[PDB]
Design a protein around this ligand. Structure first.
Ligand SMILES: *[C@@H]1O[C@H](CO)[C@@H](O[C@@H]2O[C@H](CO)[C@@H](O[C@@H]3O[C@H](CO)[C@@H](O)[C@H](O[C@H]4O[C@H](CO)[C@@H](O)[C@H](O)[C@@H]4O[C@H]4O[C@H](CO)[C@@H](O)[C@H](O)[C@@H]4O[C@H]4O[C@H](CO)[C@@H](O)[C@H](O)[C@@H]4O)[C@@H]3O)[C@H](O)[C@H]2NC(C)=O)[C@H](O)[C@H]1NC(C)=O
Ligand SMILES: *[C@@H]1O[C@H](CO)[C@@H](O[C@@H]2O[C@H](CO)[C@@H](O[C@@H]3O[C@H](CO)[C@@H](O)[C@H](O[C@H]4O[C@H](CO)[C@@H](O)[C@H](O)[C@@H]4O[C@H]4O[C@H](CO)[C@@H](O)[C@H](O)[C@@H]4O[C@H]4O[C@H](CO)[C@@H](O)[C@H](O)[C@@H]4O)[C@@H]3O)[C@H](O)[C@H]2NC(C)=O)[C@H](O)[C@H]1NC(C)=O
Ligand SMILES: *[C@@H]1O[C@H](CO)[C@@H](O[C@@H]2O[C@H](CO)[C@@H](O[C@@H]3O[C@H](CO)[C@@H](O)[C@H](O[C@H]4O[C@H](CO)[C@@H](O)[C@H](O)[C@@H]4O[C@H]4O[C@H](CO)[C@@H](O)[C@H](O)[C@@H]4O[C@H]4O[C@H](CO)[C@@H](O)[C@H](O)[C@@H]4O)[C@@H]3O)[C@H](O)[C@H]2NC(C)=O)[C@H](O)[C@H]1NC(C)=O
Ligand SMILES: *[C@@H]1O[C@H](CO)[C@@H](O)[C@H](O)[C@H]1NC(C)=O
Ligand SMILES: *[C@@H]1O[C@H](CO)[C@@H](O)[C@H](O)[C@H]1NC(C)=O
Ligand SMILES: *[C@@H]1O[C@H](CO)[C@@H](O)[C@H](O)[C@H]1NC(C)=O
Ligand SMILES: *[C@H]1O[C@H](CO)[C@@H](O)[C@H](O)[C@H]1NC(C)=O
Ligand SMILES: *[C@H]1O[C@H](CO)[C@@H](O)[C@H](O)[C@H]1NC(C)=O
Ligand SMILES: *[C@H]1O[C@H](CO)[C@@H](O)[C@H](O)[C@H]1NC(C)=O
Ligand SMILES: OC[C@H]1O[C@H](O)[C@@H](O)[C@@H](O)[C@@H]1O
Ligand SMILES: OC[C@H]1O[C@H](O)[C@@H](O)[C@@H](O)[C@@H]1O
Ligand SMILES: OC[C@H]1O[C@H](O)[C@@H](O)[C@@H](O)[C@@H]1O
Ligand SMILES: [Ca+2]
Ligand SMILES: [Ca+2]
Ligand SMILES: [Ca+2]
Lengths: 388, 120, 104, 388, 388, 120, 120
């Protein structure tokens, strides 16, 4: 086709309807489903699909034991038809690694896979199913990328990497690629002290990213990248309605340019649609672990250090395991504004369910309605006892 | 009303492992965070961890991570606690409390148990 | 990590008195402070949850106030039943931390 | 392509030949077939396929237990190649829900999936594999749709929903969609007191629907929708030859505008081709449960309150379990008239076969011949003892 | 498309990044993967894929026992999506045999499969999925071909066969095909005493092949074929850095036109990119068996009888089983020079791991970076105890 | 001819569970609906349910749904009936009949059994 | 330091099968090629084969292929040797050596054992 341009704004977000659910672990009890994690949803001009890091194993396979381990030569970024489980027979391996991101640019698709020793990691960039550019570790400490899709404006796809301490100050870089080649890269700027696992979306020629300040912040950092001038900046979501996990209990006035104190060196990947009054934050119900999942509408959540929920929608109940969550939109769909969407990683097995040696996930992805639709909870639905 | 029937005292030597009980009543055991405190003469009230009946979620004050192990019996509506490799430094009155905000982590410990003295 | 410093280890007052026990936290705990009464027979009860909120059946003569890091328990009219130790405790962030307590 | 227009009439119906049979439960004993129900047959300009509500489980999988349950977050409308079983590896999930309908309009395809709590259901409408419009529950009681394909004339696809008591008076609505968007909707009219599970076909610019009056009627209600003026009307099939199940024994003169008294608050989804002398009704052989399946030709069955069979054709014997039945035609096939077709849901497991905890089905779909062909019975063919 | 012409030279080889890894044996513990060996990587103008000789059996299938046997009527040349395992459900059988080669010529693809008794072998040549030409055994003793892809210039695909003693002087022939038909064939010439299992690549209108002198040479023979004049010649890689396996310990000055003495009648298939200073040799770490795998840069390795490593990169550690290795390049990729690539066969089971009756392999394929990337080892990753 | 050999009388206390037999003969047991009636002095002839040998299909007069349980032995050509949690109100003469229309639900009960009196 | 504790002498008749031990110490047993030599009065020092602890790889001087069988116990850090169908011609002092170049095949046998005399 032709390089896509984020020309429309966000649609009014009134509720959320289901979009897709793979039910992968339930179907995984009696089928050749693959152990995966860090999934995400991402579209082409012709189809949206499921993306996640496979573990080179089936759930019910003897190698699924140990799969709580994040990195190995055995992981691959794989994609599959929307709402189907990541089966052995139907998955397309995009590239090899233990960290990735991917996005269609209107003409073709760029997929990035990082892999290797912790202190010698590499970022190999593919473009139209061919490897094109290589980026070696700069701070020699777990080079990781988005674990979510990227966003492109006029062939330009900015991607945010991080290399260095999770526990402290690392070297985060926004790379700006075009057809597989770097156009430029620049040091994370603004007031975000640490940045990891960016959930990014585009609207009106500008990409925004709600990331995860792992170090000290319990409110998320935000990077707004201008794909045309090629400059970005960073800040924290002002709302007192905290969204990291673990996180402190909701205070009454937030902090806009500093990490929100309370819990350290830990968190989880989450997203958010900051669109003025059209603002919805996503979070785990518990402040203690990755369980539950809600979508709260906190108008001017980004700018207003005293913004509170005005409306809500429950996704996963507190009793059910949730996890990493991200954003994506079908930038090629018929319409006058972009319909925001998201997914929620629903993890089963280690560490919360130690009666099994595997860790794996299921996906449930939701999209905005302008209508006020009735809610339901979408759990993974697997009886862990069936696996013993 | 709500009630927390803890077990009786324990006398024991080092290296061992005592295992307490906290029997719930007067509420839906499944809808609340069961906390466990350690009032030590000299270290005051210290919080050990949480166990949630609904889904078996747990978390421990890092300090007591290796010593304590929380479990529960939804059947009998009873929370249990098990300290390992006892020492005189683990001698104290172990209390069990309920969450003020049910499944949430706030609202104070609205109901406690009468304690369960361990003596090493 | 958030240390609660329950100032004034012990307290002395005549029956009928107004007493105030102070609990100053290490970090702005954001009104997530609590008060517990531990009777001489070991029994603990929740007095005030969340700075000023009174618990079920709690004697109205028990006022609770404060902000930021400094909070206070105030018993308007002292009574014998009020001879116990008082602990403050925060639930702003895990791990829940208690205050040194104060015997009056 | 170009919006399709129902321009031809029905072919003379002289007999029925087999069209397709998935044999899903037999092949399901040793293969990763999915638990499904409420199936149906439906064509594209290029291919007809199989449609049914999956249960997020394989028959031989430990989660198949409980699958007698109609609704859960675990169901998905899925489609697969004609006459193949709904395998895990080969099914396309259309959308998420526990009630659905779908139809190609000549250019693309519209699929509707309802899902959610009984008192907060939603109807999300997809068009060309993208969600387009949302319809929230209006009477807050199990919003359900056709469980069959719809029919479009010149881009207009009328769909009939119902919300409210099954046991009594509900709120039934004919929606008229175009490219995913509502053009108008209107209250069920005519003399049909209750309407559910519409089997619809088109011929000569007009869609007809033999539905299921669950409340009191043991003769089916009929809705004739005029896709161009956008008006419909309703009545009952006059024939004394009753077709619901459970139903009373055949009387000698029927009732045309009132439910046929005998059995209440129960029934099953069935279809029929009302074409004057070219009229064939489909029914279960037993009046008591969903077993057996016959096609009877009852000329002027709709208008004639004294119409009786003139010819017949047995599909499933009385000894074999049958179930939901519907209509569909390949509106894109070469020819001078539409060749009517149908399928029959053949259920195995609970409740008739309680020696297994699953309920599932197989499909057998037939199509009209102008020739008087010899009959055969088409049973599911699975030995339930093989599953214990 | 249009016949492809090797018009570009090799890119500067600075390191190697991962390209693809099937992880086939791990996923083979719980999935219908096929027993295979002699794999290889090979591209089309639209996609690169995996190639290997299947054994007509799944690893976990009772027929996998005996699969240490090289030839049977049960082997087929099969191909599958890059980085996916050779599953029963997803492999395309190219042709039938126990020896093969294949290459796309820019317009279509030629695949060759040899099969039959040891003393009556045949070479059937397919072109655009149709059998086209037949070549019967000339020396009546195991007619074998490349076990790697071929290389075509302007529709001309030269292929090197061998027939006769492995242990001694055989009849090696370079065939020159075009659209499935022989244009000419000629006797192996130059100073290579024995030639088998040619790893070939093209660059600047000329194909080069590092083969395996099985007889006496522990340094590899090299055949440079001129696809346009249709003449070739042969010589040995001058480097003292020996690459066959088994092989003697590295001497200090090599031999350029004679087999390097030390170990006889044995070896293994390997490749190399001889490009002046841009020269990298691949070898097993051990001189004794097929374990480990390194890539050493030995400038002017071909011409310089005293060339030694200047840089290196470890692929498979000495503790892990490796095996046959080959070359391939995506001759249709966007760029100014060809990015050399290779794969490594990683064998599991007999003979090194006799606690199982099968022999099979996994693939790991690497490609050149101009960047100096950090290394990692890529093992098969299967715990052989899981199979007992 | 056709014949329906039912079992003999039963005497028993409340809460129990008697189990009747009806042995077919003179026809293909598999091709007919076996009905079961309850003639009660005071409630007249009431219909309990149907059991069909061909495919094990069953249906019970809603009234007797929880009390009766129909089964059969195609081997011995015998239909069985089992009433649960007996009471004096279940004392009566239990009959078994055959369908007038074989597998269909019409044609009357063409053949009956001599009854089987249960006494509680 | 490094040490190679071999077993004691063996006396035995033809057709039998003795099985030697070589206990490693003073190094990572897993990182070295364990060789096995046969010093025969009359045939001098002959090399039998190699066994590598890291991955169980083995190779035997073709001559001793059918007689010797190398194995090892990574647990006890001990290499074993087993000669089959003994004969007087297999009487000698069996030594075990370590590789000069660890996993590689060069660097000489840097450490040996005191031998293990077999007498047939
Ligand atoms: C059919 O569907 C419709 C549409 O979905 C349903 O109507 C919806 O009903 C929803 C729930 O009843 C409702 O959401 C709620 O909206 C209010 C604002 O109007 C919002 O405040 C609610 O959110 C708070 O309460 C929930 C639990 O109900 C919390 O989980 C949530 O996070 C919010 O609470 C926490 O954060 C606040 C902000 O900082 C705190 O001040 C508050 O106390 C609370 O704090 C604790 O919890 C946190 C973790 O849970 C923790 O971090 C913190 O430190 C504290 O511990 C909720 O979003 C929708 O408004 C409504 N939608 C519409 C369109 O009307 C309808 O019911 C369905 N119909 C039927 C018939 O069932
Ligand atoms: C080769 O193939 C050809 C073509 O298929 C075969 O010829 C066909 O043979 C068919 C059966 O012999 C025949 O169908 C019959 O056609 C007559 C009308 O001509 C029709 O009345 C028959 O239908 C009644 O009887 C069947 C059982 O045979 C019933 O199942 C059916 O429902 C009809 O009966 C019920 O409804 C009537 C209408 O209201 C009632 O009055 C009737 O008594 C009966 O009622 C009871 O049953 C119902 C449930 O079963 C129940 O609801 C009700 O209350 C009562 O309990 C049947 O359709 C085709 O005419 C004929 N086709 C052709 C082209 O000639 C041929 O045999 C094959 N060849 C060989 C050599 O085997
Ligand atoms: C992050 O990644 C980077 C990039 O990968 C890492 O840096 C690289 O580090 C590599 C290893 O440290 C290094 O490779 C080496 O390069 C030197 C030449 O500069 C080369 O000589 C080395 O190769 C010899 O040594 C290895 C073992 O280290 C052997 O396996 C290899 O075959 C070579 O040795 C054998 O052959 C020679 C030539 O004939 C003999 O003379 C030699 O003695 C030896 O002989 C024995 O071994 C053979 C079998 O092993 C046998 O046949 C023979 O008979 C003898 O028994 C090695 O290739 C890269 O230079 C370097 N890359 C860059 C870009 O700088 C970096 O470490 C990583 N970073 C961190 C922080 O970990
Ligand atoms: C998983 O592996 C560990 C060792 O890596 C072992 O202790 C555990 O039992 C394994 N799980 C199973 C089911 O074998
Ligand atoms: C199905 O589940 C029910 C409980 O939900 C249990 O009683 C029954 O035995 C299960 N079936 C099997 C085969 O386990
Ligand atoms: C493999 O087959 C051989 C005979 O061909 C037999 O000795 C061996 O046990 C077989 N393996 C298994 C697992 O049966
Ligand atoms: C939008 O971005 C630039 C603006 O001039 C333009 O060149 C590009 O082609 C545009 N593409 C589309 C599909 O609008
Ligand atoms: C039939 O319906 C209307 C009638 O004018 C027309 O515009 C439409 O394109 C027609 N389409 C076809 C394929 O006949
Ligand atoms: C390159 O090879 C010959 C040179 O004249 C030419 O005829 C052929 O078409 C060329 N093809 C391409 C794609 O360059
Ligand atoms: O509707 C009332 C209630 O839910 C909604 C909003 O008005 C919130 O401010 C409030 O939480
Ligand atoms: O053919 C005779 C018989 O079957 C046919 C029709 O004529 C029916 O009226 C009749 O049932
Ligand atoms: O870098 C030093 C060392 O590695 C590199 C080359 O210079 C080699 O000659 C040497 O092996
Ligand atoms: Ca944080
Ligand atoms: Ca009815
Ligand atoms: Ca050789």
């Amino acid at each position: 086709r032709d390089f896509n341009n984020l020309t429309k704004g966000l649609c009014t977000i009134n509720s959320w309807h289901i979009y897709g659910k793979d039910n992968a672990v339930r179907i995984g009890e009696d089928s050749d489903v693959l152990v995966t994690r860090e999934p995400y949803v991402s579209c082409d001009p012709d189809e949206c699909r499921f993306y996640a890091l496979s573990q080179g194993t089936t759930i019910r396979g003897k190698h699924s034991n140990g799969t709580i381990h994040d990195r190995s030569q055995y992981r691959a970024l794989i994609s599959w038809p929307l709402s189907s489980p990541p089966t052995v027979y139907n998955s397309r391996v995009e590239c090899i690694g233990w960290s990735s991101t991917s996005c269609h640019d209107g003409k073709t698709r760029m997929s990035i896979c990082i892999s290797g020793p912790n202190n010698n990691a590499s970022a190999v960039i593919w473009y139209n199913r061919r490897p094109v550019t290589e980026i070696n570790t700069w701070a020699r400490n777990i080079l990781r990328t988005q674990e979510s899709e990227c966003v492109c404006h006029n062939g330009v796809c900015p991607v945010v990497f991080t290399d260095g301490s999770a526990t402290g100050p690392a070297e985060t870089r926004i790379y700006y690629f075009k057809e597989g080649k770097i156009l430029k890269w620049e040091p994370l700027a603004g007031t975000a002290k640490h940045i990891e696992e960016c959930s990014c979306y585009g609207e009106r020629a500008e990409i925004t990213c709600t990331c995860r300040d792992n170090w000290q912040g319990s409110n998320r950092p935000v990077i707004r990248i201008d794909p045309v001038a090629m400059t970005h900046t960073s800040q924290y979501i002002c709302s007192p309605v905290l969204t990291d996990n673990p996180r402190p209990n909701d205070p009454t006035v937030g902090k806009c340019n500093d990490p929100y104190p309370g819990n350290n060196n830990n968190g989880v990947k989450g997203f958010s649609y900051l669109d003025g009054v059209n603002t919805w934050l996503g979070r785990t119900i518990s402040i203690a672990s990755r369980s539950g999942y809600e979508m709260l509408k906190v108008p001017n959540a980004l700018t207003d250090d005293k913004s509170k929920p005005t409306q809500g929608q429950t996704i996963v109940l507190n009793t059910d395991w949730s996890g990493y969550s991200g954003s994506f939109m079908d930038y090629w769909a018929e319409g006058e504004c972009y319909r925001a969407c998201f997914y929620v990683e629903l993890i089963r097995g280690r560490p919360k369910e130690d009666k099994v040696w595997w860790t794996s996930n299921s996906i449930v992805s939701m999209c905005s309605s302008t209508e006020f639709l009735g809610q339901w909870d979408w759990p993974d639905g697997a009886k862990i006892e069936y696996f013993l | 009303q709500v009630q927390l029937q803890q077990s009786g005292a324990e006398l024991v030597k080092p290296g061992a492992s005592v295992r307490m009980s906290c029997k719930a009543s007067g509420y839906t055991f499944t809808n609340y965070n069961m906390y466990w405190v350690k009032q030590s003469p000299g270290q005051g009230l210290e919080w050990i961890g949480i166990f949630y009946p609904g889904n078996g979620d747990t978390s421990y004050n890092q300090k007591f991570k290796d010593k304590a192990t929380l479990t529960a019996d939804k059947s009998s509506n009873t929370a249990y606690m098990q300290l390992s490799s006892l020492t005189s430094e683990d001698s104290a009155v172990y209390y069990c409390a309920r969450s003020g905000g049910s499944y949430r982590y706030d609202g104070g410990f609205d109901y406690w148990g009468q304690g369960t003295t361990v003596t090493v | 990590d958030i240390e609660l410093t329950q100032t004034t280890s012990s307290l002395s007052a005549s029956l009928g008195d107004r007493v105030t026990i102070s609990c100053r936290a290490s970090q702005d705990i954001s009104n997530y402070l609590n008060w517990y009464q531990q009777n001489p027979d070991g029994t603990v009860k929740l007095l005030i949850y969340y700075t000023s909120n009174l618990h079920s059946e709690v004697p109205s003569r028990f006022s609770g106030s404060g902000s930021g890091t400094d909070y206070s328990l105030t018993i308007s009219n002292l009574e014998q039943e009020d001879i116990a130790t008082y602990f403050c405790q925060q639930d702003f962030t895990l791990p829940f931390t208690f205050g040194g307590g104060t015997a009056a």
